[PDB]
Amino acid sequence: HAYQGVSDTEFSEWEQVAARVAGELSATALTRDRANQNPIAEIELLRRYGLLSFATAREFGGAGGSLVQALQLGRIIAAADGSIGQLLVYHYSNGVWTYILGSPTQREYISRGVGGHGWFQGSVSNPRDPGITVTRTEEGYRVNGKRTFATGVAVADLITVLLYEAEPINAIIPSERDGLRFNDDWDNLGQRLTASGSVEFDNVLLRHDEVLTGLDEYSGLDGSRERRDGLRALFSQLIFVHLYLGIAEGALAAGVAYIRDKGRPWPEAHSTDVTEDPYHQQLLGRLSAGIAAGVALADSATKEFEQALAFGEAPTEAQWGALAIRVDQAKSVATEISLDVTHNIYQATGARSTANSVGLDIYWRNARTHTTHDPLPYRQREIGRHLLTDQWPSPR
Amino acid sequence: HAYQGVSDTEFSEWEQVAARVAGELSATALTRDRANQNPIAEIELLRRYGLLSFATAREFGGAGGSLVQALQLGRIIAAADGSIGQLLVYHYSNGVWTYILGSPTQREYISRGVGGHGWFQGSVSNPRDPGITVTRTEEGYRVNGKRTFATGVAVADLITVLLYEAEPINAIIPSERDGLRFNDDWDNLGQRLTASGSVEFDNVLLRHDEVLTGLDEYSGLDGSRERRDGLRALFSQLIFVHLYLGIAEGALAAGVAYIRDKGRPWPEAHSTDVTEDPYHQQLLGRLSAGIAAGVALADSATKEFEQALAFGEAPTEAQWGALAIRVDQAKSVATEISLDVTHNIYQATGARSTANSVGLDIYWRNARTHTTHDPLPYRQREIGRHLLTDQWPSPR
Amino acid sequence: HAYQGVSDTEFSEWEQVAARVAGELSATALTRDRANQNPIAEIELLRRYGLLSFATAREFGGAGGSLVQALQLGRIIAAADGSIGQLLVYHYSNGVWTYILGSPTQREYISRGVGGHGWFQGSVSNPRDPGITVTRTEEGYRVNGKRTFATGVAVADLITVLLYEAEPINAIIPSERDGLRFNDDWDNLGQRLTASGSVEFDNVLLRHDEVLTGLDEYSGLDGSRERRDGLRALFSQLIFVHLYLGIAEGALAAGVAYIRDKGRPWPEAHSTDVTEDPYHQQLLGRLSAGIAAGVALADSATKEFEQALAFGEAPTEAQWGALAIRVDQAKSVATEISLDVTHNIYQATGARSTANSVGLDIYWRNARTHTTHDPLPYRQREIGRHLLTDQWPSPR
Amino acid sequence: AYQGVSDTEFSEWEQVAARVAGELSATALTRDRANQNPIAEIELLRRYGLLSFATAREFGGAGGSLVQALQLGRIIAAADGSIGQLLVYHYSNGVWTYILGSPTQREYISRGVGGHGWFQGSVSNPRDPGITVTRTEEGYRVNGKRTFATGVAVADLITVLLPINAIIPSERDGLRFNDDWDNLGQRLTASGSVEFDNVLLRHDEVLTGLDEYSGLDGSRERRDGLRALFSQLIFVHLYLGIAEGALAAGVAYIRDKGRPWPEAHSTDVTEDPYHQQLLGRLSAGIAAGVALADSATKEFEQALAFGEAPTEAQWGALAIRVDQAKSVATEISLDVTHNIYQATGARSTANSVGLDIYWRNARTHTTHDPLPYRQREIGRHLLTDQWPSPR
């Protein structure tokens, strides 16, 4: 199967690669965030260090890492820069999507380009966009309409277009396909460097040989195709989990670093050593403990996703539902702890730390932004609904 | 005497004036916040609507409002713009400071300027500024050194300069006084339009007639002078309470306004009406309740401060301690709810609300910044310390 | 008219009476709680000290106190014994109920009994009791069935029987009225001494002279009668607020007392004095601040209720809804802080405090029990619904 | 030692623990209110092989690991917090005597615990004044009063920690078990006080396992420190077990006795949006605590199996991991057992329902050592680089 994984010794080296990339991204995060430019240089930095091809099989020039390993590297990157961290994990997830959606020949085309040609994958997947028209011609499909939240599409080399019709249509197109217009309407609270602006489709052609047909081998009668395709949405929730935990780890380390370097003791405190303040220590310890719990659950849930992905068949209703519950559980804890850390870190760093030259708020802006992707109470509700009614979460 | 208050019907008219000002500030808050300019226009707006002279007696051209009424108008302004709200309450507090510190003739000089000539009062009061020197000459005192967090000084007409704590030297100087250099080093997370940058004193003269001597009539032997002077710091904490609550009220109203105008229902919700989501309603209702509790305690603590200020003598150790405990309580509650509201409002507003064209984060940036003025756990510790040891809070 | 209030100096004397009663109840609270007996002696203690007649006009032998003052006395009693505090405020609320529902001659009959004859008022008002049959007789009404949560009925001298039919029937009957059986089925977590067991109705007679007719002067066409009657349910929510805050004050005081008398320092702590522990002080200060906020909002809400009760007409749609919103706000904050205090106090008191001879849990058992009377999230939801839809709460 | 059984074999042990849990949960309220010594419950664990689960098969045990043993502890703790504490304290006492005992002493204990149903108790409260040990050629004479002696009144082999560490039979003269345990929760843990009236500790019974570790470089201190770290670990699993039992009890009450609120959109109580959200939040919290707890136990097993004592960094890193697990497990167990009543309702507060037994249990034990100081240790290491060390 795909996503075989690298050895423990080799992954330690890939963690050092990610740490090297994280240090450089971290030193320029505030300047780049303020500039709000498309992250071309940052994508090139990820490409040059072999991180874009990490989750591609070694046959195609990738490292052959597992999804657990890939998202763990994503946490290291997301801790330095939430925006570039989101781009990396979305790229990995887009590869998981086209692996699920692609035929074997289509899978090979994508893996060769991602593994050995530096392709960055983006997708147009927002299902709430109105005014989208799609018509079928002999040449292929003609798509018209404006799509929003198109993360990484303006910097991607291969674009996955997902259309939510009565019969859904998913296709892969190159970046230079005519009719694509990228609007400069992304000026957001956080995740500013993710290129999540809107994309205009002006009579865009999706060729017939570009339509993904991997789901055809799964039964459209017993729900196998829906549950196989539903793994895409479950993995998207998992990358969000690791993204939030990565941002939380960066905010905690940044707050710790500010206190050790610039912190002044409070005059009412017993000690003149700011590092000995009892309230700073308790608060940082509570947050650190909470992150560790979220990470432990995250890595457990990601391993369970890999097992479901490697099933010889589509997961059953109970297998899919149990995995969705675990993903829901990881999503709930990761959202709460990341919001908790990025929000309350200022209570320990103090008044002078609120200067934009310090920029401790970038973690909050990033965490607070992406946590609104889908509402937290409804993911918690799904867990409790299963406890009260025995009904499994279903691909919606 | 001072801060007698206007009638209930007249104050309803002043609340109407504040609402008119709040609407204009709210509509331009985002654009002004980005430009980061000194708030000269906003102070003239406060001036032309009579809000700067509201807390000055009618004999000087003011409205004759009370401190309870003045801080209530402050909450209305602070809800529209946290920065301008801070300036207004800091101005009111600076009048209370010079009332406590000023002689009879000095009080009338300031009241006539603030009451009938539009003077805005700023203060240089940070006690943690090192390297400050003062030399007494035949004409007065020559002051040198850099002072930080000089809120409103760059836009003030009358500046109060406070030096030391043991043998203090407090004086009022005009904005035209030679030697004042305003550094352009205020680029902050929030409270950006408060003019809280640093100020350089280059051989600044404080004339002998400008030295405040109101504290002379209080005994320096039994602590009466310290407890009378200590009312200034308690009133600072009090305006912080009202500022935080105003900001929290603005964030709640802005989130409600967004949901009603731009909100859309979550597809998993039972209702297609976004205003009927049970989690939006529950969250907003919890936040609304917490704000109301904070306001009830805040206005009660302000009334208790007015009574202590109007005492014929300085408040005793127990009177000062009980007032400080109640102000600590209001500070703790107002800190917690304002951080709660401004952080969690995004859970109800959704992903599209994170655009900077919406700017719902300005309330968080403002509250998150100012709540770090002095650390929350130590104000809570002071309350618990009194309960466990019987030791009242005492002036510094 | 009614609930006019006593003077400030005289209310201090009544607060001294309540403190004396609270001290005695507090010393026997644990023993009486475990015995689970009907609080006949405690009702007689309240009677001897004039607390049962405090809210009755002076012409009838009562003190002439207001509802604000009466519930403030209830908080003092509730802090010593949550069960006895609930009985006192239920007695007051039952007096408010019969004041709304009673005719002028019926009001005088009850006031003369409660004011000068020591009557304790209980009610049978649970609207969720099924299988309750009531048939009209020439003599009056015959009522059969089982009613639950009949707080204080087994110790009441005057019992209000509320029947929720197509035409609601409310009447007052003596405790010796034939057909009343008191089942020994009240063995609860907390509120154990409130006599909240079930009561059987064996063909009980409600004479026509006993049917309360005070609501007849209010129109049943424009909602006046519904909103006038709805003040009863709003006052029930108000007494719950004060009950919860009193329990929280008692729990905070009991924890402070244990720490000062029995507390030992933690070996890792900086100080060998347990009263100097920074985490004890911080937590106790946060809890103290939260209680003070809830109290300030509670007393503000009670005053607004008194104004509504004294309206020349029934409250309008807007007047009733605004009062319901404020009571909802007070109910939300009082529930949260009382559960917060009684649950978290053990973190400061330590391991030895968990002995049943200490009995710190009685506050939690009491607060945790009564806060389930009606679900908190639906009260918060009502506030958020008004913000989002503009719909005022209405009598249900 | 602590090798562990296979995955398929451990599934059968989970079912054995579920059978024991179901029987305990049927009399949980009646036994808790009776406040009697849990003699029959300890025999229940003994008959089903749970007392010898963490002992090698060569001694008559199951050959399970510490990760597996504490997982079964969570199953028992979910049904009865008191009995769950006794089981994990028994397991922890085996780890203590394994660390403290000589190779010949280890086999004596393994044969009795594995092949004769011995229950191990500990007298190990470090905050007891008046404790006095006196040396004699007869051995050692111990006098004073020790409190919180969990399981001692029902233990067969008793470890006394004074350093002087020894094991004595339950029949040793001088032991006076006082009947002063009337607590909020953990009522059936036999945690009363034990009077020592000139109790003899023979030289042959003194544990000498720590002698082979150097007392000069801190190796003996760090090796012995694993005892306290494992104590904090069994507290983690106990709190999560109680939280699991409370959540399941609240869910089962709503499904079987719950009534919809008249303001709710649905007449089905299981479709209340606030019940679902609250329970789902609590469920996710427990799941995160379990994942961290089982991770920390795996790291402890490796530390114990190092042979050599863990270094300052290895011991410190393990202690940080255990503090993190302790913090999360404390917060979620208090959260679950306290907030479950918001979803169960007014009628669920009757003592015939007894849903408060979970809160009383978790609220009691979480005060064993103060939570803020365990959190402070994590933050202190982040700010000062100082690892936790054997204190």
Side-chain angles (χ1 to χ4, degrees), chain D residues 317-328:
Chain D
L318 176 60
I320 291 296
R321 196 70 163 167
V322 173
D323 288 339
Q324 293 168 326
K326 180 70 180 302
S327 177
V328 170

Side-chain angles (χ1 to χ4, degrees), chain C residues 139-175:
Chain C
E139 195 172 9
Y141 288 103
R142 292 294 177 173
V143 177
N144 292 273
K146 173 186 178 182
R147 295 293 232 95
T148 182
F149 294 102
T151 291
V153 172
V155 297
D157 304 292
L158 194 68
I159 306 174
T160 312
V161 178
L162 296 88
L163 304 173
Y164 304 94
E165 294 284 346
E167 285 193 9
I169 305 174
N170 304 313
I172 50 173
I173 55 176
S175 62

Side-chain angles (χ1 to χ4, degrees), chain A residues 120-190:
Chain A
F120 183 87
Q121 284 189 265
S123 62
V124 183
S125 53
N126 191 339
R128 313 187 70 177
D129 291 318
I132 309 304
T133 59
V134 40
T135 54
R136 184 184 184 182
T137 332
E138 182 178 1
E139 192 171 2
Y141 292 99
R142 287 297 180 169
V143 181
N144 289 272
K146 171 180 170 180
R147 293 291 220 101
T148 62
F149 292 109
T151 293
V153 174
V155 296
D157 306 292
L158 187 72
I159 303 166
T160 312
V161 176
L162 291 84
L163 301 177
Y164 303 91
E165 295 289 312
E167 204 177 58
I169 299 163
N170 305 312
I172 48 173
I173 59 176
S175 53
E176 70 270 15
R177 179 57 48 81
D178 291 359
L180 292 171
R181 175 178 185 176
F182 309 109
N183 298 331
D184 183 63
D185 58 351
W186 186 244
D187 180 10
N188 217 67
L189 177 58

